[PDB]
Amino acid sequence: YSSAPLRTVKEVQFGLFSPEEVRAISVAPRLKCQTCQEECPGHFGHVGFIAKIKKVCECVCMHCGKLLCKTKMVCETRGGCGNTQPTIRKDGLKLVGSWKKDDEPELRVLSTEEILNIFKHISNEVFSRPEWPVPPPPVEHNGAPHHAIEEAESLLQFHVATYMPQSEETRAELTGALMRCLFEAGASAELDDCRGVSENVILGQMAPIGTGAFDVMIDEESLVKYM
Amino acid sequence: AIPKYERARILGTRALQISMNAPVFVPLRIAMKELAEKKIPLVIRRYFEDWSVEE
Amino acid sequence: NKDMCPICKTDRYLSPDVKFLVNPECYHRICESCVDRIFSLGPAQCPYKGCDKILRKNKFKTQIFDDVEVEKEVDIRKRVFNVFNKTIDDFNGDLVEYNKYLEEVEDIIYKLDHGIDVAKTEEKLRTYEEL
């Protein structure tokens, strides 16, 4: 038994975790459960956006984070740095930028740190940002040449990608991200009103179809007159 | 509130109430009898407009 | 004791927002951060070696005159002037009496600052206020 109010899910607001929230949500046997001594839902602890990341990088300058779009190859210094934006291509699980000279073009790999820094410089503000949790049981320091670090980072990225009638009621009786199916919904902070049959079926609540398209209230005006 | 399948739910809803020892003003058979005599004290909130089962 | 708290040694360069306050009890400079840390919970001994006077948190106030000694004289004079309030008219034009009265008040303030006769001076001050 729980003392909290019993409610129904009226909206599902998809979004994306912030690094702060993942650390805040995390409780760490801590995932009888050592955290609640219970009924236990499961306590958290602490690849699909590569195309989106590439598009964002092409659509914005990669030095000042100011909107330029993909075809543009110059910052158009309006506030700007004037650097010529590279042509970004997706190779494996990495992004490679190429600069054309003013004679093969210069090429280098845009480090994930560089991409993150630029994204943080870019001007949903609450639920899903471009810059942006271990499932619970129920579900460089020294030396390290650049080659070794790059190989380790590639292996870690590859591993991450791979990892990712019993009642009288029934007796008598006898367009939303969730409805379509989710990554896109989280990126755009899509709000699902849960007005469709699919959403209610997923959440296990009475659907607004047939006997559920209305509400049965209780009237006291008739009750007093019935005695 | 605008100023002034339903049968299946009302019959089942009142049948459950009767099975739970609710007063009878006239379990599925009892609910059907109440509906026939218009003695079901509920209002259907069509989505809104509130309509009494009696009317 | 130039631009930092003697207790926590917080320099103004590293924390420009730091400010200092003085309690009229022993006129000891201390930063507001230390004041909140120490005296917020309750009264406690002043955190200087050789000083044991109990000072309250509310009594802390900002320092106006840079010279600490002048601050003591003014505050003591403020207390004395509250008890002693007279004008030339009060003496009915007697300038000699007015001048003598002012001289006596200054002597009282000087004695309080130097604590030569604090016990007797305080008793005399109390008697006049009641009267």
Place this chain on the structure above:
Amino acid sequence: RRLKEEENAATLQLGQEFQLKQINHQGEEEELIALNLSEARLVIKEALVERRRAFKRSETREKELESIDVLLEQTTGGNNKDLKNTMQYLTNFSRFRDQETVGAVIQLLKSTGLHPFEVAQLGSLACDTADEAKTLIPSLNNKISDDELERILKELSNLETL
């Protein structure tokens, strides 16, 4: 579009549900109703007697305490231990007994213009000097002069019963 100021009586930061401006059930703006111990005692007992009257239709400290206790038992249901402790606490810690005394106190302190919380403290805590009130009620600092508070406290003790 909603996601994640600690409450402090001294700073008059009472939280979200006890803000200065309140909305009643009629939608009309109203001032937060904060009651001193004497005012709260009258409100609770006045409601209890009215409730007792509705049910039937369908002085020294000891005698008043007994009268309150018997009334409380008659006109309250189960799980009334909290209210029993409250009435006992209110009767043994109030400063004004009759309604006239409470009315005068409200009229006196309503001219100060302080926060409803602070005025309730003034009528609930006995103090002798403005320094005691200032330290016991920090919110009064830099809001009311010592002379004004001194006269208010002296007048408050004048109307204190017995």
Place this chain on the structure above:
Amino acid sequence: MFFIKDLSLNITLHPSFFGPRMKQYLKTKLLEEVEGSCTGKFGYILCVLDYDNIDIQRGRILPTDGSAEFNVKYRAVVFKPFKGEVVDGTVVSCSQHGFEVQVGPMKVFVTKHLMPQDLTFNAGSNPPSYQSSEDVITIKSRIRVKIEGCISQVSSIHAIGSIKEDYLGAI
């Protein structure tokens, strides 16, 4: 502190009460469920004012439960403790860790670290009491306390008191 607060509640009636006098049962449920209850958001809900004017909106029948949910609006006096507030009470329990002060429906706990250094615990006196050169604090002794902190749970409120500041302690 005591307040008068306009509150709302969601009462549920079993179908057994679906009679011509269901409103009377709602008033009984409101009194028997709210009065004496400790809502951490609003404090100790003590008494309900205007007992003959509670607003009872149209009830809603739950799909499978069969009960009717009623939204009830009422006026009640609620006691909400705030940190930094000064209260008076009578000590009810004393122990080595500290003593409890009863303030209305609330109990305030004063730990050793929140007491003046002069006060010392002593179990020799029966009942155990805290003794100091100027006075002794024990059960039934009136104490003026300042709430240093409150932990308002969903249905429980606890506070820690301090008596170290000036003009506090025994009256």
